[PDB]
Design a protein around this ligand. Structure first.
Ligand SMILES: Cc1nnc2ccc(NCCc3ccccc3)nn12
Length: 127
């Protein structure tokens, strides 16, 4: 069995910025979700080999996880807040696509998504 390479976290030719909204995404959003008791399955790419999920990467074609988001935020990989918000949404959506309602992993994603939505509701206006 094999995992794909992880999503890109470094690209020198990609234009990027350090905005107040992106700072909020790291200091408030990512940090809140990262410390949560249900964050652990989402702190690194899904390891389909170790978890014995050979169909995972046959179904999930745009993988995303908080370890990748954390690296992207720390490396100032993004141009805007929308790009980062899309990464969080991809992460939750993938979990719902792959799994069944009521599964433990889905309940965990739902708890993190609730907090995500609460924090993004207060995303500051751009400076
Ligand atoms: C992320 C992600 N997206 N879909 C899946 C499917 C399984 C999975 N297993 C990780 C270990 C685990 C088992 C039970 C409950 C919580 C975590 N992680 N995962």
């Amino acid at each position: 069995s094999m995992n794909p390479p992880p999503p890109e976290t470094s690209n020198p030719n990609k234009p990027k910025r350090q905005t107040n909204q992106l700072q909020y995404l790291l200091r408030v959003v990512l940090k809140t979700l990262w410390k949560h008791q249900f964050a652990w399955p989402f702190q690194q790419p899904v390891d389909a080999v170790k978890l014995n999920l050979p169909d995972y990467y046959k179904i999930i074609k745009t993988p995303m996880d908080m370890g990748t988001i954390k690296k992207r935020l720390e490396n100032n990989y993004y141009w805007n807040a929308q790009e980062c918000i899309q990464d969080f949404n991809t992460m939750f959506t993938n979990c719902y696509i792959y799994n069944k309602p009521g599964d433990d992993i889905v309940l965990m994603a739902e708890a993190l998504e609730k907090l995500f939505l609460q924090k993004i509701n207060e995303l500051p206006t751009e400076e």
